[PDB]
Amino acid sequence: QWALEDFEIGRPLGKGKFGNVYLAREKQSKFILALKVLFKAQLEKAGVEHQLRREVEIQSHLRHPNILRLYGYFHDATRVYLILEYAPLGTVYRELQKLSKFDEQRTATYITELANALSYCHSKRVIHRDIKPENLLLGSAGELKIADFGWSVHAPSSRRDTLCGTLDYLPPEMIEGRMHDEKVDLWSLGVLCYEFLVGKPPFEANTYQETYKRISRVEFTFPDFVTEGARDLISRLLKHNPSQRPMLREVLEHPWITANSSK
Ligand SMILES: O=C(O)c1ccc(Nc2nccc(Nc3ccccc3F)n2)cc1
């Protein structure tokens, strides 16, 4: 069992509504990790305790290269602490703001990485991971890690979309006040891919109700440059009916994936 003084604390990597993630290192081994700090006073207000409590339980059990590993958890009085894997390269979000778009090789690789994570997660009976770029981190060299977990944290940047970066990634079934099956995730995949190539999500709009309009009615159009295998994958992924959406492995199999995927 750990405690706060077992750790040296660096800068905040990102600041959230319930707390902050700090760069840290265990004092003895001098091994660097990321410490999520949860103020716990917003935690009651927001009515989230027991959930989080079993969430550390679940995510404790998740081992994947494309999933950020939760090493441990502890708490004191005012704060809960998640001891996390450190991802040196930061957010795919700032990367995407850097380049303004990715290419098909990068994109295809990220998408297979993600598909593996979600496939793994499903086999572990875990659904509805938050895969929007803000929640995705970059490991040692290029590798892509799903952060999720602690409700969303940001490093200072852009400013533009703050949130209201929200439902672009929400599926019609979720937004529409209904339940969801594992297939929720494959909608996000579609959206992600689009963004990667385009630089913006397919449903982006200057009002919430209009974004909704486009999502639930699945109204989205490709710029000239998007290749059609890309189009096929995306169109195949974004379907009002969950049942018409591919299974993950089918996604990995997709011809365009295999074509440009470095993995
Ligand atoms: O800003 C940067 O250069 C930067 C941001 C993050 C980072 N690595 C990391 N590792 C593990 C967890 C974690 N939380 C987190 C922090 C901020 C936003 C989103 C996050 F999910 N962030 C490295 C650099």
Swiss-Prot record:
GO terms for cellular component: axon hillock; basolateral plasma membrane; centriole; centrosome; chromosome passenger complex; ciliary basal body; cytosol; germinal vesicle. Its main location: cytoplasm. ATP binds at K17, K36, E85, Y86, A87, E134, N135, D148. The active site is at D130 (proton acceptor). The gene is AURKA. Highly expressed in testis and weakly in skeletal muscle, thymus and spleen. Also highly expressed in colon, ovarian, prostate, neuroblastoma, breast and cervical cancer cell lines. This is Aurora kinase A. There is a cross-link at K132 (Glycyl lysine isopeptide (Lys-Gly) (interchain with G-Cter in SUMO2)). The modification Phosphoserine is found at S216. Centrosome amplification can occur when the cycles are uncoupled, and this amplification is associated with cancer and with an increase in the levels of chromosomal instability. Keywords: ATP-binding, Cell cycle, Cell division, Cell membrane, Cell projection, Cilium, Cilium biogenesis/degradation, Cytoplasm, Cytoskeleton, Isopeptide bond, Kinase, Membrane, Microtubule, Mitosis, Nucleotide-binding, Phosphoprotein, Proto-oncogene, Serine/threonine-protein kinase, Transferase, Ubl conjugation. GO terms for biological process: anterior/posterior axis specification; apoptotic process; cell division; centrosome localization; cilium disassembly; G2/M transition of mitotic cell cycle; liver regeneration; mitotic cell cycle. It catalyses: L-seryl-[protein] + ATP = O-phospho-L-seryl-[protein] + ADP + H(+); L-threonyl-[protein] + ATP = O-phospho-L-threonyl-[protein] + ADP + H(+). Activated by phosphorylation at Thr-162; this brings about a change in the conformation of the activation segment. Phosphorylation at Thr-162 varies during the cell cycle and is highest during M phase. Autophosphorylated at Thr-162 upon TPX2 binding. Thr-162 can be phosphorylated by several kinases, including PAK and PKA. Protein phosphatase type 1 (PP1) binds AURKA and inhibits its activity by dephosphorylating Thr-162 during mitosis. Phosphorylation at Ser-216 decreases the kinase activity. Ubiquitinated by the E3 ubiquitin-protein ligase complex SCF(FBXL7) during mitosis, leading to its degradation by the proteasome. Ubiquitinated by CHFR, leading to its degradation by the proteasome. Ubiquitinated by the anaphase-promoting complex (APC), leading to its degradation by the proteasome. Ubiquitinated by the CUL3-KLHL18 ligase leading to its activation at the centrosome which is required for initiating mitotic entry. Ubiquitination mediated by CUL3-KLHL18 ligase does not lead to its degradation by the proteasome. Mitotic serine/threonine kinase that contributes to the regulation of cell cycle progression. Associates with the centrosome and the spindle microtubules during mitosis and plays a critical role in various mitotic events including the establishment of mitotic spindle, centrosome duplication, centrosome separation as well as maturation, chromosomal alignment, spindle assembly checkpoint, and cytokinesis. Required for normal spindle positioning during mitosis and for the localization of NUMA1 and DCTN1 to the cell cortex during metaphase. Required for initial activation of CDK1 at centrosomes. Transmembrane segments: none annotated. Induction: Expression is cell-cycle regulated, low in G1/S, accumulates during G2/M, and decreases rapidly after. The modification Phosphothreonine is found at D161, T162. Part of a complex composed of NEDD9, AURKA and CTTN; within the complex NEDD9 acts as a scaffold protein and is required for complex formation. Identified in a complex with AUNIP and NIN. Interacts with FBXL7. Interacts with CPEB1, JTB, TACC1, TPX2, PPP2CA, as well as with the protein phosphatase type 1 (PP1) isoforms PPP1CA, PPP1CB and PPP1CC. Also interacts with its substrates ARHGEF2, BORA, KIF2A, PARD3, and p53/TP53. Interaction with BORA promotes phosphorylation of PLK1. Interacts with CIMAP3. Interacts with GADD45A, competing with its oligomerization. It is found in: Cytoplasm, Cytoskeleton, Microtubule organizing center, Centrosome; Cytoplasm, Cytoskeleton, Spindle pole; Cytoplasm, Cytoskeleton, Microtubule organizing center, Centrosome, Centriole; Cell projection, Neuron projection. Changing F39A: Decreases the interaction with phosphatase type 1 isoforms. Changing Y208A: Reduces binding to MYCN. Belongs to the protein kinase superfamily. Ser/Thr protein kinase family. Aurora subfamily. GO terms for molecular function: ATP binding; histone H3S10 kinase activity; molecular function activator activity; protein heterodimerization activity; protein kinase activity; protein kinase binding; protein serine kinase activity; protein serine/threonine kinase activity. Changing F220A: Decreases the interaction with phosphatase type 1 isoforms. Activation of CDK1, appears to be an upstream event of AURKA activation. Phosphatase inhibitor-2 (PPP1R2) and TPX2 act also as activators. Inactivated by the G2 checkpoint. Inhibited by GADD45A and p53/TP53, and through dephosphorylation by protein phosphatase type 1 (PP1). MLN8054 is also a potent and selective inhibitor. Activated during the early phase of cilia disassembly in the presence of CIMAP3. Inhibited by the small molecule inhibitor VX-680.
